Amino acid sequence: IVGEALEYVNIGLSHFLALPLAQRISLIIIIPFIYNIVWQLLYSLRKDRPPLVFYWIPWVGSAVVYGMKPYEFFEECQKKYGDIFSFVLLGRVMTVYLGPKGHEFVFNAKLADVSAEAAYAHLTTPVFGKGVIYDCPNSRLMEQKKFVKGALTKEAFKSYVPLIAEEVYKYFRDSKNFRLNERTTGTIDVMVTQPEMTIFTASRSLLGKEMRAKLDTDFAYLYSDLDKGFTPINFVFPNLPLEHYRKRDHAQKAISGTYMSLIKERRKNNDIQDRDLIDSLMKNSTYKDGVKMTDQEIANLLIGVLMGGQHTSAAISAWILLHLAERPDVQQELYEEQMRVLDGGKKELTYDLLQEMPLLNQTIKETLRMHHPLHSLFRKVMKDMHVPNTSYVIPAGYHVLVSPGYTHLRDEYFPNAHQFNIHRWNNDSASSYSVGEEVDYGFGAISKGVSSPYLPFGGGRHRCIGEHFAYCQLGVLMSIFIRTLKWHYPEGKTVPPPDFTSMVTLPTGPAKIIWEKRNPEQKIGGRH
Ligand code: HEM
């Protein structure tokens, strides 16, 4: 008789359902908890899986320690498990592959194996709009990047430089944070000034004068509203009926409506030049199967592009100011380079002269090493992946995480990695360089290997295309800061630690510096 056991199964299930409610809820908690611990122990027996970081709370996983201190998390995990390990994160299993072989595994993964859009779309599509970036197939994305790269040529940068410079000078002249014609010293929060300087400079050069003019009005607040939908909370809860979710949606419609108004206006008057990225996309937005981008998709793409440059660049110029505030030796060395390359300030800044300022560009390069703004990049695994030279298979449904910014801070590859030293890039001041062979995924030839330990712009098919614009924007900005101001910390303040909980690895605020005019009597012209 084992039927008698089957009877007591049914009886036991019957008594379960009749349990007092305090015992039921108590069982609703402890049973997943116990089963979770039981499941991790069994999982650790598989030799075709990377080790899984142990965790107590089901579903939540290591979310708290990963979210607050991801590089300390990766360091402890690397010590216990080596370079490949998994961890549970708010319902998803993330497989991390640290170091240059990790860069190869994730950035050069076959298009069939992994998907960036399946990882990112739920966050970006409500902010940018439909049909662009991650709300479309990869081949569309490749061509959208090709279209945008067409306003990111050397000739475009040659004309952007005086525009960016003018925006910087107007901001020194007009912003409450400076007012250089009335004040010779002052205190600023770089997390206030740098997001504003970034949007002004990128709008004026990428979007044009009209969109720049609209930033002088209350329209400028729509970018802040749009910004607030770009939070890690939208990573797990992409649609909650709360108020900031609808200010995001409203801002996306109002901003893209403004871009579309300008677009349809320029087509109506045949006023399509080579001024800005709007002109460029109006003349160059037809895919290779004949389909043209709609005016809505062009506007959504312009949002994406500005947004992709907004927080990365603002973060980096904040960190450059913060590192230089305790390094008056570096400020003095950069000042001397400015005086030699620009003939005591007599020469006007041009894109070509920016290329003759190695120490300035090394400063950007070194800030991008220490403060990579995206600590983790993600893909969702679409087919089972064997990791080379191991027995591991990463099953479809997992995510892979790569973190070049973690490698940037490893002493093995950058001696004394937590020291800020622009001279470690002596003789190698280029934003990056294909160290050999190349490959074209649709938006131009880029490095084929991605094993460099230094990868601030990623690699492979999802590689950044804003790198030269970022260097051009940061280079003009810092050139002018250095020629105009010295700055330092208030007594007892130093370089703040990064805040890893936001989209980018921002300084913990308020990160304040004190500035003073190098030439207290110098006046910025124009009208205000
Ligand atoms: C300091 C400045 C910047 C840094 C450090 C940076 C970093 C990155 C990284 C690491 C990626 C790859 C993401 C991944 O592989 O998952 C990326 C992609 C991208 N970024 Fe940048 N970026 C910067 C500035 C910009 C600017 C100024 C723009 C636009 C003008 C831009 C637009 C893009 C675009 C279009 C992509 C392609 C995304 C894809 O193909 O999936 N970025 N960026």
Side-chain angles (χ1 to χ4, degrees):
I1 313 168
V2 88
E4 189 129 73
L6 301 142
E7 301 195 341
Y8 281 92
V9 177
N10 292 333
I11 302 189
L13 155 67
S14 143
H15 283 70
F16 178 94
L17 294 162
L19 276 171
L21 193 34
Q23 303 193 294
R24 290 193 285 165
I25 295 298
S26 140
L27 275 178
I28 296 172
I29 294 179
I30 187 188
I31 268 303
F33 177 85
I34 294 298
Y35 176 48
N36 193 257
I37 300 181
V38 169
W39 183 92
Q40 295 181 65
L41 298 165
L42 299 166
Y43 186 91
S44 72
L45 306 163
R46 312 205 49 150
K47 300 320 172 183
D48 54 341
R49 294 302 183 267
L52 177 74
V53 179
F54 176 81
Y55 60 105
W56 289 116
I57 306 186
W59 189 82
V60 174
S62 326
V64 160
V65 55
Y66 165 70
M68 276 155 33
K69 291 154 193 171
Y71 292 161
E72 295 168 57
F73 177 64
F74 294 163
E75 184 181 22
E76 296 314 302
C77 294
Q78 186 181 30
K79 283 170 185 170
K80 306 175 190 171
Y81 307 106
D83 293 331
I84 325 168
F85 52 89
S86 296
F87 71 90
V88 167
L89 176 66
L90 307 177
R92 310 129 173 102
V93 184
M94 320 290 313
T95 300
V96 181
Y97 198 154
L98 298 177
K101 286 297 180 59
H103 308 171
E104 275 291 337
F105 188 65
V106 174
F107 286 121
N108 267 345
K110 298 182 183 75
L111 182 63
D113 293 345
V114 305
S115 171
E117 65 269 33
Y120 290 148
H122 304 279
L123 159 67
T124 60
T125 300
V127 184
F128 302 162
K130 297 314 199 226
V132 302
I133 322 289
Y134 300 129
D135 189 42
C136 59
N138 190 263
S139 22
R140 298 304 206 208
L141 172 60
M142 298 303 98
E143 298 206 81
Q144 285 157 26
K145 296 170 68 169
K146 183 185 56 200
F147 304 153
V148 173
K149 246 191 174 162
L152 300 177
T153 71
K154 182 167 182 181
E155 279 79 11
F157 302 133
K158 278 166 177 178
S159 51
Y160 293 166
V161 164
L163 304 175
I164 297 168
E166 168 187 332
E167 290 302 317
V168 177
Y169 279 116
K170 294 162 66 183
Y171 191 87
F172 284 167
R173 186 193 63 200
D174 301 337
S175 168
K176 300 234 180 190
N177 298 306
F178 288 106
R179 302 294 293 179
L180 291 197
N181 291 336
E182 298 133 46
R183 300 204 284 152
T184 56
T185 182
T187 307
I188 65 172
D189 183 346
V190 296
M191 280 309 308
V192 168
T193 57
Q194 286 335 98
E196 303 180 358
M197 298 188 83
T198 300
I199 193 76
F200 290 146
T201 56
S203 289
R204 176 62 188 91
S205 49
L206 290 175
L207 298 178
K209 216 172 180 182
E210 305 85 331
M211 289 317 102
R212 169 57 180 95
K214 301 206 138 59
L215 286 180
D216 300 331
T217 81
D218 274 351
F219 174 82
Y221 299 155
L222 294 172
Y223 287 102
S224 180
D225 295 350
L226 193 65
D227 201 42
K228 294 174 164 60
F230 207 66
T231 309
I233 182 192
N234 302 63
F235 249 149
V236 189
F237 320 103
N239 279 279
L240 267 34
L242 207 55
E243 181 73 15
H244 83 103
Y245 279 80
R246 287 137 49 194
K247 258 174 184 178
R248 172 201 68 181
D249 292 343
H250 181 250
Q252 188 284 341
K253 293 188 183 66
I255 290 155
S256 70
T258 307
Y259 298 171
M260 287 193 296
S261 175
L262 181 60
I263 286 166
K264 280 150 158 50
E265 183 71 26
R266 292 183 169 178
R267 201 159 37 234
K268 271 150 184 167
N269 304 325
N270 269 261
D271 189 30
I272 303 187
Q273 323 280 356
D274 303 322
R275 304 161 282 196
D276 44 46
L277 177 59
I278 300 180
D279 279 335
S280 189
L281 292 165
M282 291 181 74
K283 292 191 294 195
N284 182 31
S285 39
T286 305
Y287 297 112
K288 60 180 188 284
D289 63 357
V291 175
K292 293 177 161 197
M293 294 184 75
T294 60
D295 286 4
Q296 182 69 66
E297 293 160 343
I298 296 169
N300 300 341
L301 177 60
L302 297 165
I303 294 176
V305 169
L306 265 268
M307 184 77 76
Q310 174 58 30
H311 306 106
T312 48
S313 180
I316 292 298
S317 74
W319 286 115
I320 293 171
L321 295 169
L322 293 172
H323 276 285
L324 269 42
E326 69 178 12
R327 297 299 299 279
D329 53 327
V330 174
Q331 295 186 43
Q332 168 183 101
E333 192 169 37
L334 294 179
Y335 189 71
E336 190 282 333
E337 178 176 80
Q338 293 296 301
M339 295 302 105
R340 173 159 43 69
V341 173
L342 299 178
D343 208 318
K346 297 315 286 179
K347 289 192 182 188
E348 183 184 354
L349 184 59
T350 65
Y351 185 66
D352 285 312
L353 286 166
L354 265 185
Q355 315 309 310
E356 303 166 65
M357 304 168 169
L359 294 176
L360 178 64
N361 294 296
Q362 286 168 224
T363 299
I364 302 163
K365 210 168 165 179
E366 177 71 341
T367 307
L368 288 158
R369 181 190 64 82
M370 291 196 60
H371 295 287
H372 195 335
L374 306 181
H375 65 74
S376 314
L377 295 317
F378 312 101
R379 312 283 184 265
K380 196 184 181 185
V381 184
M382 303 285 95
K383 304 182 323 179
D384 294 36
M385 309 181 79
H386 177 251
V387 356
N389 310 341
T390 81
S391 48
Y392 300 146
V393 179
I394 315 297
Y398 283 29
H399 303 80
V400 286
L401 190 171
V402 67
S403 182
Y406 174 91
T407 295
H408 289 183
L409 297 164
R410 301 312 290 174
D411 286 326
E412 315 73 89
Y413 298 101
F414 309 88
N416 289 119
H418 286 271
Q419 165 72 266
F420 185 88
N421 180 11
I422 79 182
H423 299 289
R424 78 172 72 246
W425 303 105
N426 279 1
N427 212 348
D428 180 16
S429 66
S431 71
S432 59
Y433 69 102
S434 172
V435 52
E437 198 195 320
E438 295 188 326
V439 53
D440 194 328
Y441 302 97
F443 56 95
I446 63 182
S447 162
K448 172 164 163 52
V450 296
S451 280
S452 180
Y454 184 65
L455 280 183
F457 302 96
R461 70 181 55 255
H462 292 289
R463 193 189 190 288
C464 188
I465 54 163
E467 158 179 24
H468 302 115
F469 176 84
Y471 265 81
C472 173
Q473 168 185 52
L474 295 156
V476 177
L477 178 69
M478 289 314 303
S479 170
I480 294 172
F481 256 97
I482 287 275
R483 273 180 291 129
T484 306
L485 306 171
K486 301 190 180 174
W487 60 92
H488 52 93
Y489 277 112
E491 305 222 1
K493 295 302 181 176
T494 191
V495 174
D499 155 55
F500 300 90
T501 75
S502 48
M503 280 301 181
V504 325
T505 55
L506 287 180
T508 302
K512 289 180 198 262
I513 60 167
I514 294 168
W515 57 263
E516 67 178 85
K517 298 181 68 191
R518 280 187 182 263
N519 184 347
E521 296 161 37
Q522 182 213 328
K523 290 298 177 258
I524 296 170
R527 312 136 87 205
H528 72 307

Coordinates of all heavy atoms in Angstrom, one line a residue, residues 107 116 120 133-134 141-142 145 148 152 206 304-306 308-310 312-313 316 368 372-374 377-379 455-459 461-467 469-470 473-474, ligand 1:
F107 N 30.8 42.6 -25.5 CA 30.7 43.7 -26.5 C 30.8 43.1 -27.9 O 30.2 43.7 -28.9 CB 31.7 44.7 -26.3 CG 31.5 45.7 -25.2 CD1 32.4 45.8 -24.2 CD2 30.3 46.5 -25.2 CE1 32.2 46.7 -23.1 CE2 30.1 47.3 -24.1 CZ 31.0 47.4 -23.1
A116 N 20.7 44.1 -26.8 CA 20.7 45.3 -26.0 C 19.3 45.9 -25.9 O 18.9 46.4 -24.8 CB 21.6 46.4 -26.6
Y120 N 17.1 47.3 -22.6 CA 17.1 48.8 -22.4 C 15.7 49.4 -22.8 O 15.4 50.5 -22.3 CB 18.2 49.5 -23.2 CG 19.6 49.2 -22.7 CD1 20.7 49.2 -23.6 CD2 19.9 49.1 -21.3 CE1 21.9 49.0 -23.2 CE2 21.2 49.0 -20.9 CZ 22.2 48.9 -21.8 OH 23.5 48.8 -21.4
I133 N 16.1 53.9 -31.7 CA 17.1 53.4 -30.8 C 16.7 52.0 -30.4 O 17.1 51.0 -31.1 CB 17.2 54.2 -29.5 CG1 17.1 55.7 -29.7 CG2 18.5 53.9 -28.8 CD1 18.3 56.3 -30.4
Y134 N 16.1 51.7 -29.3 CA 15.8 50.4 -28.8 C 14.3 50.0 -29.0 O 14.0 48.8 -28.7 CB 16.1 50.3 -27.3 CG 17.6 50.6 -27.1 CD1 18.0 51.5 -26.1 CD2 18.5 50.0 -27.8 CE1 19.3 51.8 -25.9 CE2 19.9 50.3 -27.7 CZ 20.3 51.2 -26.7 OH 21.6 51.5 -26.5
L141 N 18.6 50.5 -35.8 CA 19.6 51.2 -34.9 C 20.9 51.5 -35.6 O 21.4 52.6 -35.5 CB 19.8 50.4 -33.6 CG 20.9 51.0 -32.7 CD1 20.6 52.4 -32.3 CD2 21.1 50.1 -31.5
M142 N 21.5 50.5 -36.2 CA 22.7 50.7 -36.9 C 22.6 51.8 -37.9 O 23.6 52.6 -38.1 CB 23.1 49.4 -37.7 CG 23.4 48.2 -36.8 SD 24.6 48.5 -35.5 CE 23.6 48.9 -34.1
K145 N 22.3 55.3 -36.2 CA 23.7 55.7 -35.8 C 24.4 56.2 -37.0 O 25.1 57.3 -36.9 CB 24.4 54.6 -35.1 CG 23.8 54.1 -33.8 CD 24.4 52.8 -33.2 CE 25.9 53.0 -32.8 NZ 26.3 51.9 -32.0
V148 N 23.1 59.8 -37.7 CA 23.6 60.8 -36.7 C 25.1 61.0 -36.9 O 25.5 62.2 -36.9 CB 23.3 60.3 -35.3 CG1 24.0 61.2 -34.2 CG2 21.8 60.3 -35.0
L152 N 28.4 64.4 -37.4 CA 29.5 64.3 -36.5 C 30.8 64.2 -37.2 O 31.5 63.2 -36.9 CB 29.2 63.2 -35.4 CG 28.0 63.3 -34.6 CD1 27.8 62.1 -33.7 CD2 27.9 64.6 -33.8
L206 N 24.1 70.9 -31.7 CA 23.4 69.8 -32.4 C 22.0 70.1 -32.9 O 21.6 69.6 -33.9 CB 23.3 68.6 -31.4 CG 24.7 67.9 -31.1 CD1 24.5 66.8 -30.1 CD2 25.3 67.4 -32.4
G304 N 16.8 61.1 -28.2 CA 17.8 60.1 -27.7 C 19.2 60.6 -27.8 O 19.9 60.5 -26.8
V305 N 19.6 61.2 -28.9 CA 20.9 61.7 -29.1 C 21.3 62.7 -28.1 O 22.4 62.6 -27.4 CB 21.1 62.2 -30.5 CG1 22.4 62.9 -30.7 CG2 21.0 61.0 -31.5
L306 N 20.5 63.7 -27.9 CA 20.8 64.7 -26.8 C 20.9 64.1 -25.5 O 21.8 64.4 -24.7 CB 19.8 65.8 -26.9 CG 20.1 67.1 -27.7 CD1 20.8 68.2 -26.9 CD2 20.9 66.7 -28.9
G308 N 21.6 60.9 -24.7 CA 22.8 60.1 -24.6 C 24.1 60.9 -24.3 O 25.0 60.4 -23.7
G309 N 24.1 62.2 -24.8 CA 25.2 63.0 -24.5 C 25.0 63.9 -23.3 O 26.0 64.5 -22.8
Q310 N 23.8 63.9 -22.7 CA 23.6 64.9 -21.6 C 24.2 64.5 -20.3 O 25.1 65.2 -19.8 CB 22.1 65.0 -21.4 CG 21.7 65.9 -20.2 CD 22.3 67.3 -20.3 OE1 22.5 67.9 -21.4 NE2 22.6 67.9 -19.1
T312 N 26.2 61.8 -19.5 CA 27.6 61.4 -19.6 C 28.6 62.6 -19.6 O 29.5 62.7 -18.8 CB 27.8 60.6 -20.9 OG1 27.2 61.3 -22.0 CG2 27.1 59.2 -20.8
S313 N 28.3 63.6 -20.4 CA 29.2 64.7 -20.5 C 29.1 65.6 -19.3 O 30.2 66.1 -18.8 CB 28.9 65.5 -21.8 OG 29.8 66.6 -22.0
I316 N 31.1 64.1 -16.6 CA 32.5 64.1 -16.8 C 33.1 65.5 -16.5 O 34.2 65.6 -15.9 CB 32.9 63.6 -18.2 CG1 32.6 62.1 -18.3 CG2 34.4 63.9 -18.5 CD1 33.4 61.3 -17.3
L368 N 37.6 60.2 -17.7 CA 36.8 59.0 -18.2 C 37.3 57.7 -17.7 O 36.5 56.7 -17.6 CB 36.8 59.1 -19.7 CG 36.0 60.1 -20.5 CD1 36.6 60.4 -21.9 CD2 34.5 59.8 -20.5
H372 N 34.1 56.6 -15.3 CA 33.2 56.0 -16.3 C 31.7 56.2 -15.9 O 31.3 55.7 -14.8 CB 33.5 54.6 -16.5 CG 32.9 54.0 -17.8 ND1 31.7 54.6 -18.4 CD2 33.2 53.0 -18.6 CE1 31.5 53.9 -19.5 NE2 32.3 52.9 -19.6
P373 N 30.9 56.9 -16.6 CA 29.6 57.3 -16.2 C 28.6 56.1 -16.2 O 27.6 56.2 -15.5 CB 29.1 58.4 -17.1 CG 30.0 58.3 -18.3 CD 31.3 57.7 -17.9
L374 N 28.9 55.0 -16.9 CA 28.0 53.9 -16.9 C 28.7 52.7 -16.2 O 29.5 52.1 -16.9 CB 27.5 53.6 -18.3 CG 26.9 54.8 -19.1 CD1 26.4 54.4 -20.4 CD2 25.8 55.4 -18.3
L377 N 27.0 47.8 -18.2 CA 26.3 47.8 -19.4 C 25.7 46.4 -19.5 O 26.3 45.4 -19.1 CB 27.2 48.0 -20.7 CG 27.8 49.4 -20.9 CD1 26.8 50.5 -20.6 CD2 29.0 49.5 -20.0
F378 N 24.4 46.3 -20.1 CA 23.7 45.1 -20.0 C 23.3 44.6 -21.4 O 23.1 45.4 -22.4 CB 22.4 45.2 -19.2 CG 22.6 45.9 -17.9 CD1 22.3 47.2 -17.7 CD2 23.1 45.2 -16.9 CE1 22.4 47.8 -16.5 CE2 23.2 45.7 -15.6 CZ 22.9 47.1 -15.4
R379 N 23.1 43.3 -21.5 CA 22.4 42.6 -22.6 C 21.5 41.5 -22.0 O 21.9 41.0 -21.0 CB 23.4 42.0 -23.7 CG 24.5 42.9 -24.1 CD 24.1 43.9 -25.2 NE 25.2 44.7 -25.7 CZ 25.5 45.9 -25.2 NH1 24.9 46.4 -24.2 NH2 26.6 46.6 -25.7
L455 N 37.9 51.2 -22.0 CA 36.8 51.2 -22.9 C 35.7 52.2 -22.5 O 34.5 51.7 -22.2 CB 36.2 49.8 -23.1 CG 36.8 48.8 -24.0 CD1 35.9 47.6 -24.0 CD2 37.0 49.3 -25.5
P456 N 35.9 53.5 -22.4 CA 34.9 54.4 -21.9 C 33.7 54.5 -22.9 O 32.6 54.9 -22.4 CB 35.6 55.7 -21.8 CG 36.8 55.6 -22.8 CD 37.1 54.2 -22.8
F457 N 33.9 54.2 -24.2 CA 32.8 54.3 -25.1 C 32.2 52.9 -25.6 O 31.5 52.9 -26.5 CB 33.2 55.2 -26.3 CG 33.6 56.6 -25.9 CD1 35.0 56.8 -25.7 CD2 32.7 57.5 -25.6 CE1 35.4 58.1 -25.2 CE2 33.1 58.8 -25.1 CZ 34.5 59.0 -24.9
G458 N 32.7 51.9 -24.9 CA 32.2 50.5 -25.2 C 32.9 50.0 -26.5 O 34.0 50.4 -26.8
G459 N 32.2 49.1 -27.1 CA 32.7 48.6 -28.4 C 31.7 47.7 -29.0 O 30.7 47.4 -28.4
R461 N 28.9 46.5 -31.8 CA 27.8 47.1 -32.6 C 27.1 48.2 -31.8 O 26.6 49.1 -32.4 CB 26.8 46.0 -33.0 CG 26.0 45.4 -31.9 CD 25.0 44.4 -32.5 NE 25.7 43.3 -33.2 CZ 25.8 43.3 -34.6 NH1 25.1 44.1 -35.3 NH2 26.5 42.3 -35.2
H462 N 27.2 48.2 -30.5 CA 26.5 49.2 -29.7 C 27.5 50.3 -29.2 O 27.1 51.1 -28.3 CB 25.8 48.5 -28.5 CG 24.7 47.7 -28.8 ND1 23.5 48.2 -29.3 CD2 24.5 46.3 -28.9 CE1 22.6 47.3 -29.6 NE2 23.3 46.1 -29.4
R463 N 28.6 50.4 -29.9 CA 29.6 51.4 -29.5 C 29.1 52.8 -29.7 O 28.4 53.1 -30.6 CB 30.9 51.2 -30.4 CG 32.1 52.0 -29.9 CD 33.3 51.9 -30.8 NE 34.5 52.5 -30.3 CZ 34.8 53.8 -30.0 NH1 33.8 54.7 -30.3 NH2 35.9 54.2 -29.5
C464 N 29.5 53.7 -28.7 CA 29.2 55.1 -28.7 C 29.6 55.7 -30.1 O 30.7 55.4 -30.6 CB 29.9 55.8 -27.6 SG 29.3 57.5 -27.4
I465 N 28.8 56.6 -30.5 CA 29.2 57.5 -31.7 C 29.4 58.9 -31.3 O 29.7 59.7 -32.2 CB 28.2 57.3 -32.8 CG1 26.8 57.6 -32.4 CG2 28.3 56.0 -33.5 CD1 25.8 57.9 -33.5
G466 N 29.2 59.3 -30.0 CA 29.4 60.6 -29.6 C 30.7 61.0 -29.1 O 31.0 62.1 -28.6
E467 N 31.7 60.0 -29.1 CA 33.0 60.2 -28.5 C 33.7 61.5 -29.0 O 34.2 62.3 -28.2 CB 33.8 59.0 -28.8 CG 35.3 59.2 -28.7 CD 36.1 57.9 -29.0 OE1 35.5 57.0 -29.7 OE2 37.2 57.8 -28.6
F469 N 32.4 64.1 -30.5 CA 31.6 65.3 -30.0 C 31.8 65.5 -28.6 O 32.0 66.7 -28.2 CB 30.1 65.1 -30.3 CG 29.3 66.2 -29.8 CD1 29.1 67.4 -30.5 CD2 28.7 66.2 -28.5 CE1 28.4 68.5 -30.1 CE2 28.0 67.2 -28.0 CZ 27.8 68.4 -28.8
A470 N 31.8 64.5 -27.7 CA 32.1 64.7 -26.3 C 33.5 65.3 -26.1 O 33.6 66.3 -25.3 CB 32.0 63.3 -25.6
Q473 N 33.2 69.0 -27.2 CA 32.5 69.8 -26.2 C 33.2 70.0 -24.9 O 33.3 71.1 -24.4 CB 31.1 69.1 -26.0 CG 30.3 69.6 -24.8 CD 29.1 68.8 -24.5 OE1 29.1 67.6 -24.4 NE2 27.9 69.5 -24.5
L474 N 33.7 68.9 -24.3 CA 34.5 69.0 -23.1 C 35.8 69.8 -23.3 O 36.2 70.5 -22.4 CB 34.9 67.6 -22.5 CG 33.6 66.8 -22.1 CD1 33.9 65.3 -22.1 CD2 33.2 67.3 -20.7
Ligands
HEM1 C1 31.7 61.4 -22.0 C2 30.8 61.1 -22.9 C3 30.2 59.7 -23.2 C4 30.4 58.5 -22.8 C5 31.4 58.1 -21.7 C6 29.6 57.6 -23.5 C7 29.5 56.2 -23.3 C8 28.8 55.3 -24.1 C9 28.9 53.8 -24.0 C10 29.7 53.0 -23.0 C11 28.0 53.3 -24.9 C12 27.8 51.8 -25.2 C13 26.6 51.3 -24.4 C14 26.5 49.8 -24.5 O1 27.4 49.2 -25.2 O2 25.6 49.2 -23.9 C15 27.4 54.4 -25.6 C16 26.5 54.3 -26.6 C17 26.0 55.3 -27.3 N1 26.2 56.6 -27.0 FE1 27.6 57.5 -25.8 N2 28.8 58.3 -24.4 C18 29.2 59.6 -24.3 C19 28.7 60.7 -25.0 C20 27.8 60.5 -26.0 C21 27.3 61.6 -26.8 C22 27.8 63.0 -26.7 C23 26.4 61.1 -27.6 C24 25.6 61.8 -28.7 C25 26.0 62.9 -29.3 C26 26.2 59.7 -27.3 C27 25.4 58.8 -28.0 C28 25.5 57.4 -27.9 C29 24.8 56.5 -28.9 C30 23.9 56.9 -30.1 C31 25.1 55.2 -28.5 C32 24.7 53.9 -29.2 C33 23.9 53.0 -28.3 C34 23.7 51.7 -29.0 O3 24.2 51.5 -30.2 O4 23.0 50.8 -28.5 N3 27.1 59.4 -26.3 N4 27.9 55.6 -25.1

